[PDB]
Amino acid sequence: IVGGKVCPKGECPWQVLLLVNGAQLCGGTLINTIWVVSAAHCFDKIKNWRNLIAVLGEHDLSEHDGDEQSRRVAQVIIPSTYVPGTTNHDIALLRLHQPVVLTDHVVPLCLPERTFSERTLAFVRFSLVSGWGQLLDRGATALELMVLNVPRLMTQDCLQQSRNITEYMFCAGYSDGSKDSCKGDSGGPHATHYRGTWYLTGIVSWGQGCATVGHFGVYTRVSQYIEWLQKLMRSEPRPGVLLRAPFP
Amino acid sequence: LICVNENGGCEQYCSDHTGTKRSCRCHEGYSLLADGVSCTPTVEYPCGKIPILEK
Ligand SMILES: O=C(NCc1cccc(-c2cccc(-c3cc4cnccc4[nH]3)c2O)c1)Nc1ccccc1
Ligand SMILES: [Ca+2]
Ligand SMILES: [Cl-]
Ligand SMILES: [Cl-]
Ligand SMILES: [Cl-]
């Protein structure tokens, strides 16, 4: 996250950290006790799935304070339409091997109904993006979880104000190079507040753009995937960690 | 009251029905109050709420 602030401990309690062999991979978003939403591209290069770990309740990566909860990943589910190495359909649904325990430090973000998300949440101007990614373009990653408030653009306005956005994405942030999500933050939440409650509206995706002047952050538009996610969450797990599921 | 306008007055989710009818709904871990629009938590850690700020 470029140009944000430390998320105070416990105020981003749905944030997930994903690790591969102990190394930072990506962020994620808890939406129920066994379900995490992240970005498909986070998983393009994984050789051995048993090395993938999800951590909830994390805050400062330099310390153990006892609020952290680590789980193995039993399933990584990716839409059939996603192509590795690209931005379109950049979403994944992760099933944890064992539920996390909800606490003051570990709480799911609400996955909205589609209509509510399209008709109401899509017009909330500002939303929060978070992660332990790079604090600047070509810089070191954050030790403490960072959060940033970013304004959303209608896609026409994004194309005009820019110096390939599909209906499965949206733009948010700033074109002056000051404030953006960055490498290391992919898979994290774009969370939108409405009438006292927070909801999942986007996933940090990727582009050449980490606070690049003339460019906005690109986010996977979660409203397009609500039905797809709900169906998968009612399904039985399948042998083999990676599953490609038809989309739509 | 129609769901596309002002969220149908609903705090959370909104369904249009046969007539000039509207039904508000609440996510799991919440219940709808008698006003027909508000949602209140029914569990300790409902989604989308930050416990240290609720306390
Ligand atoms: O290597 C493949 N996947 C692994 C993998 C894992 C985790 C992270 C990344 C990754 C790599 C570089 C930049 C970003 C990034 C830029 C950016 C800007 N703004 C916000 C967030 C952002 N994230 C990024 O997330 C990549 N796929 C691949 C590649 C090439 C060809 C085929 C497949
Ligand atoms: Ca820690
Ligand atoms: Cl586990
Ligand atoms: Cl079903
Ligand atoms: Cl099934």
Side-chain angles (χ1 to χ4, degrees):
Chain A
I1 299 297
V2 183
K5 61 165 198 167
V6 173
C7 185
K9 181 179 158 71
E11 298 191 18
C12 286
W14 34 76
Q15 175 75 52
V16 179
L17 176 61
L18 298 176
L19 299 178
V20 165
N21 300 118
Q24 182 177 336
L25 179 66
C26 271
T29 307
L30 191 72
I31 60 166
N32 199 341
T33 63
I34 61 162
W35 295 112
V36 166
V37 181
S38 185
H41 85 252
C42 295
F43 309 100
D44 293 342
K45 298 263 167 67
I46 299 300
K47 295 127 181 287
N48 189 7
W49 301 95
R50 77 193 63 203
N51 301 154
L52 174 62
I53 295 296
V55 189
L56 269 299
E58 187 51 274
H59 174 63
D60 181 337
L61 308 181
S62 76
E63 63 158 9
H64 172 86
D65 65 16
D67 296 327
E68 304 92 343
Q69 294 185 43
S70 294
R71 302 288 183 267
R72 300 188 289 283
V73 174
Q75 199 105 79
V76 177
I77 308 167
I78 281 172
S80 64
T81 50
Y82 168 73
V83 178
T86 66
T87 56
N88 213 25
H89 306 288
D90 194 12
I91 177 164
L93 177 67
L94 276 60
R95 192 185 174 109
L96 303 185
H97 189 242
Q98 193 172 247
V100 294
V101 184
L102 304 186
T103 62
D104 290 0
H105 294 95
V106 173
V107 179
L109 188 54
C110 307
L111 186 72
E113 293 191 355
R114 183 183 54 77
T115 49
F116 174 66
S117 194
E118 289 179 353
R119 293 162 177 175
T120 297
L121 294 180
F123 304 99
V124 178
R125 184 155 179 241
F126 285 95
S127 290
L128 293 185
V129 302
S130 51
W132 292 270
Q134 297 180 185
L135 293 166
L136 8 51
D137 187 41
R138 312 274 250 150
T141 57
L143 286 188
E144 285 189 290
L145 180 61
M146 302 284 316
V147 61
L148 176 65
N149 201 210
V150 290
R152 177 165 175 173
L153 292 88
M154 289 189 191
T155 287
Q156 200 178 348
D157 304 324
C158 189
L159 298 177
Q160 282 174 11
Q161 290 182 219
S162 295
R163 292 180 186 178
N164 205 64
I165 312 298
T166 65
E167 61 178 325
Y168 300 102
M169 311 164 188
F170 67 85
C171 299
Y174 300 88
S175 57
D176 69 353
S178 60
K179 283 182 289 298
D180 202 5
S181 56
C182 201
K183 175 174 180 186
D185 296 318
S186 292
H190 176 276
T192 304
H193 179 266
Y194 186 83
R195 302 214 231 162
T197 300
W198 296 85
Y199 300 91
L200 185 61
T201 47
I203 303 154
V204 178
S205 177
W206 60 342
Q208 318 319 92
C210 176
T212 301
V213 174
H215 297 327
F216 290 96
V218 66
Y219 297 83
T220 305
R221 190 186 299 245
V222 173
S223 57
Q224 299 277 27
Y225 302 94
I226 302 301
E227 293 162 359
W228 181 81
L229 294 166
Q230 287 167 350
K231 178 169 169 183
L232 291 163
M233 295 190 287
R234 290 184 300 267
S235 77
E236 297 288 340
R238 276 219 144 214
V241 170
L242 184 72
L243 178 70
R244 296 183 57 245
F247 180 83
Chain B
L1 296 162
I2 212 176
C3 300
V4 64
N5 182 45
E6 218 96 307
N7 202 41
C10 303
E11 178 180 332
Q12 298 189 355
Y13 310 139
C14 188
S15 293
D16 295 295
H17 283 313
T18 194
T20 80
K21 303 204 184 183
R22 170 281 268 144
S23 275
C24 297
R25 288 174 295 94
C26 299
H27 202 100
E28 186 191 318
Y30 291 85
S31 289
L32 192 70
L33 300 189
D35 64 13
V37 300
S38 301
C39 297
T40 194
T42 57
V43 296
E44 192 178 1
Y45 293 113
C47 66
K49 254 52 149 96
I50 303 171
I52 65 169
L53 304 181
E54 300 290 322
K55 289 138 66 252

